[PDB]
Design goal:
Layout: E1 2-3, E2 8-9, E3 13-16, E4 32-33, E5 37-40, E6 46-48, E7 54-55, E8 65-70, E9 83-85, E10 91-92, E11 96-100, H1 113-116, E12 124-127, E13 199-201, E14 204-206, E15 213-215, E16 222-224, E17 230-232, E18 235-237, E19 245-247, E20 250-252, E21 259-264, E22 267-272, E23 280-282, E24 306-308, E25 311-313, H2 315-319, E26 342-343, E27 347-349, E28 367-368, E29 378-383, E30 398-399, E31 403-407, H3 420-423, E32 432-435, H4 440-443, E33 473-474, E34 479-480, E35 492-495, E36 498-501, E37 529-531, E38 534-536
Parallel strand pairs: 1-2, 2-4, 3-5, 4-7, 5-8, 6-9, 7-10, 8-11, 11-12, 19-22, 23-24, 24-26, 25-27, 26-28, 27-29, 28-30, 29-31, 31-32
Antiparallel strand pairs: 13-14, 15-16, 17-18, 19-20, 21-22, 33-34, 35-36, 37-38
The structure holds a molecule of 2 linked components (NAG-NAG) and 2-acetamido-2-deoxy-beta-D-glucopyranose (7 copies).
Disulfide bonds: 3-6, 106-133, 136-144, 140-152, 160-168, 164-176, 177-185, 181-193, 196-205, 209-236, 240-251, 255-270, 273-277, 450-459, 454-467, 470-479, 483-499, 502-515, 506-523, 526-535
Organism: Homo sapiens
Extracellular side: 1-549
Length: 549
Amino acid sequence: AVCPRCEVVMGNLEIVLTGHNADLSFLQWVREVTGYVLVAMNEFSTLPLPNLRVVRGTQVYDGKFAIFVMLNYNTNSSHALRQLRLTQLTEILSGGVYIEKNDKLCHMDTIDWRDIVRDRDAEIVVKDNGRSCPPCHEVCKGRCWGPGSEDCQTLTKTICAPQCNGHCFGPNPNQCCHDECAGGCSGPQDTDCFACRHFNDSGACVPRCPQPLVYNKLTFQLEPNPHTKYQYGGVCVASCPHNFVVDQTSCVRACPPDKMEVDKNGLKMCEPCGGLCPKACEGTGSGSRFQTVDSSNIDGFVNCTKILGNLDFLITGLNGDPWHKIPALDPEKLNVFRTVREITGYLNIQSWPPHMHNFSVFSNLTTIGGRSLYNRGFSLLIMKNLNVTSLGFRSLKEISAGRIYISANRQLCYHHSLNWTKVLRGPTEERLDIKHNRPRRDCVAEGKVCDPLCSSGGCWGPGPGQCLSCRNYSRGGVCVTHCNFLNGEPREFAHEAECFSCHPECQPMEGTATCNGSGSDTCAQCAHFRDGPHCVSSCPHGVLGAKGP
Ligand SMILES: *[C@@H]1O[C@H](CO)[C@@H](O[C@@H]2O[C@H](CO)[C@@H](O)[C@H](O)[C@H]2NC(C)=O)[C@H](O)[C@H]1NC(C)=O
Ligand SMILES: *C1O[C@H](CO)[C@@H](O)[C@H](O)[C@H]1NC(C)=O
Ligand SMILES: *[C@@H]1O[C@H](CO)[C@@H](O)[C@H](O)[C@H]1NC(C)=O
Ligand SMILES: *[C@@H]1O[C@H](CO)[C@@H](O)[C@H](O)[C@H]1NC(C)=O
Ligand SMILES: *[C@@H]1O[C@H](CO)[C@@H](O)[C@H](O)[C@H]1NC(C)=O
Ligand SMILES: *[C@@H]1O[C@H](CO)[C@@H](O)[C@H](O)[C@H]1NC(C)=O
Ligand SMILES: *[C@@H]1O[C@H](CO)[C@@H](O)[C@H](O)[C@H]1NC(C)=O
Ligand SMILES: *[C@H]1O[C@H](CO)[C@@H](O)[C@H](O)[C@H]1NC(C)=O
């Protein structure tokens, strides 16, 4: 029904430059136009809008017209606009009317425009049109869109009683329009409006569409509602246009600058990403214009989460190259890679800024694909970085294919203990080229080994946040001796050895578990009020759900 057998025209209805024998039939079923109607520079004889009841003018041509009909005739021929067939035009919600310079347009001087127009200071300008026009049928009582007995304008407005604020269907104080009508009505009900103030659900003029969740007397919380509907400005719809997507409750063209299209259980929605929304970008190397990230490149990675391909950090890439004039990298511009979670191909690091003792810049890198390899098949290559003390790939859980090369980093520690077979899946056999970094014996004696809270896997550097996996528990990627099970400011629970807080308002219990899960329906005791299995703050001040709040 809605559209940009169309019934609602979401936006403006612009007809301009149309030929004498053009099929305007698609419009026949059109009931409402949300913006304005513009009719200019055409040669057809009649504008067929049998069903047009309402023009809204929520956008308005020239600054004050919801209707604009101008210059619809051509001198060289007898083709021109004879009649505006608006036989059902009941109301215009904002904006005046401009009908001028239509040399053959008849009758427009007979219509009580001030009857159709809600705006009591809208500009009405009908003039210089048809000149030898026929009279209205005697039945039209002076007011017509046509020469025939069925082309009448019938009046709509009715002087009205105090109680009604301009909104009524007869002169009585008992004949008020329902609060939800934009303009006039033909009864006191939701379903009797000429046009809705807010939304239209399948007939009823309603202040919101049927909501995405509904209260349950049986569970005492909210739940998914099989009667739910989404907004398309005016029309409450069951599913969105073949083009569109759902953002919370509305239908939109596309997600806001903070969300991604997540496809789930037969509905495409717009969910918040949190930090940043995935952005794929081209890697360096074999298949690119760049064999190294460098000064002329590094901007092209901002806000990047997935690298399609590889990353290559070569010596001229860092120190510049005086001959061809690509300046040295500013070291702190490397923070740009903090946002990277995946590398599709390989990571190759052969030069690193001297004052940076680790690759913490990739502290969020999760997955090295090895979808392309680098020398004799290395998915990871860290070579001759003389100032690097620790890898620091705190997030890296997967290298999907290829071999590893970590050599000649004279000062590199913490890497001896690492179980690569947890990180690098596939055969282990022969995939490890690791040599001539800081000798283990020396590391052990400067105390540069895994934190005791680390499991026998190993770490990516010093401290409890560099572990591959914890001995006991973890909280936000940092190994801890204990969760706040029976003390500690934000009280907590464990699931598969991590700590999450209790539902924001359980009562914190001294020396006993506060909760065994997230949610109100799992606290040991509520610090506020309770409603069935659930701890809640504000009591349900209005049962917004099943049927009526
Ligand atoms: C990884 O290396 C960074 C950068 O070199 C280290 O950060 C420095 O740490 C020392 C403490 O030992 C501070 O006094 C420096 O001022 C820090 N420098 C800057 C600017 O970051 C960090 O210690 C290392 N972190 C890891 C992974 O252990
Ligand atoms: C490394 O872990 C894997 C599986 O997680 C296991 O097969 C292997 O025994 C570990 N290596 C050591 C140090 O035993
Ligand atoms: C509201 O929706 C129904 C949907 O079929 C439609 O027929 C009705 O005319 C509309 N009423 C308005 C625009 O107020
Ligand atoms: C990256 O995202 C940040 C944080 O939302 C924002 O300030 C910035 O506009 C983005 N930059 C680019 C080029 O995407
Ligand atoms: C690089 O490593 C060497 C070798 O120990 C050290 O002397 C030098 O100061 C380091 N440079 C910086 C600034 O880290
Ligand atoms: C953590 O794990 C170790 C090794 O199994 C254990 O002996 C130690 O008591 C644990 N510490 C805590 C606080 O649970
Ligand atoms: C807490 O969680 C576990 C498993 O999810 C369950 O054994 C236990 O019964 C729960 N506690 C409550 C409130 O019943
Ligand atoms: C990684 O942590 C840093 C912290 O500043 C942040 O910039 C980035 O969005 C995080 N990304 C992931 C995958 O958590």
